[PDB]
């Protein structure tokens, strides 16, 4: 790996610099390098890893959607034949997207998840695993679409089981996991009722625990709760 010669602390420092400069590809490479040093990650370091790859794959997903829409329009009746170029370029972006997902899932499997014993770290990583299988599912169309969906579901479910046992209902990681699992149900699994039910129960149980929080923790929890409400409004 190209980052094998750089100190762990220097990689973390440069990831923070890359974030400030909005250089998310660099940020992701630095954090990949830091993970490959083999030490566990702190909370702050997990956040850097998450931000970097979310930004990279976010750009790819937005691009893929534009191209897929153009491709779908070309394959209607009345549409003029423009040759293989739209499909080719959509496939190019899709392959790069799948490569980023595979890289992240590879880091989780080798060996972040197996060393993660605390609830905060284990739930975060299993949520991430769910998320990146979900992004793979967004572009999947073949024999493995079903298996990819089940891989996402399985990761989210294991995360949910731990979070409900080990974390308060207002914990931001627990809340963010439930948000993303509800999105999985609505957008991927064709289960809008499961999505709505999860969003509602999550919201109500968090609401009832807000009284236990400080001002700062309250602000953190309520921000995510608003996103659950935004989805419920969109869905009902």
């Amino acid at each position: 790996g190209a980052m094998g010669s750089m100190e762990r602390a220097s990689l973390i420092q440069k990831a923070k610099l890359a974030e400030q400069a909005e250089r998310y590809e660099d940020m992701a490479a630095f954090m990949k390098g830091a993970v490959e040093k083999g030490e566990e990650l702190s909370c702050e370091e997990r956040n850097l890893l998450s931000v970097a790859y979310k930004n990279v794959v976010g750009g790819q997903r937005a691009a893929w959607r534009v191209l897929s829409s153009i491709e779908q329009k070309s394959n209607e009746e009345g549409s003029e034949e423009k040759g293989p170029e739209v499909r080719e370029y959509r496939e190019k972006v899709e392959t790069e997207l799948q490569g980023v997902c595979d890289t992240v899932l590879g880091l989780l499997d080798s060996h972040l998840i197996k060393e993660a014993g605390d609830a905060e770290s284990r739930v975060f990583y299993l949520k991430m695993k769910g998320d990146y299988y979900r992004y793979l599912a967004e572009v999947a169309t073949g024999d493995d679409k079903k298996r990819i969906i089940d891989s996402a579901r399985s990761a989210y479910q294991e995360a949910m089981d731990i979070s409900k046992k080990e974390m308060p209902p207002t914990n931001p990681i627990r809340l963010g996991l439930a948000l993303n699992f509800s999105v999985f149900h609505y957008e991927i699994a064709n289960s809008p009722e499961e999505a709505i039910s999860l969003a509602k129960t999550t919201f109500d149980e968090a609401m009832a625990d807000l009284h236990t929080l400080s001002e700062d923790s309250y602000k953190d929890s309520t921000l995510i709760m608003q996103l659950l409400r935004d989805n419920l409004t969109l869905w009902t």
Binding site: L179, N180, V183, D230
Partner: peptide, 9 residues
Amino acid sequence: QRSTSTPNV
């Protein structure tokens, strides 16, 4: 429009 998932903080 698409559902909202967790943002970057």
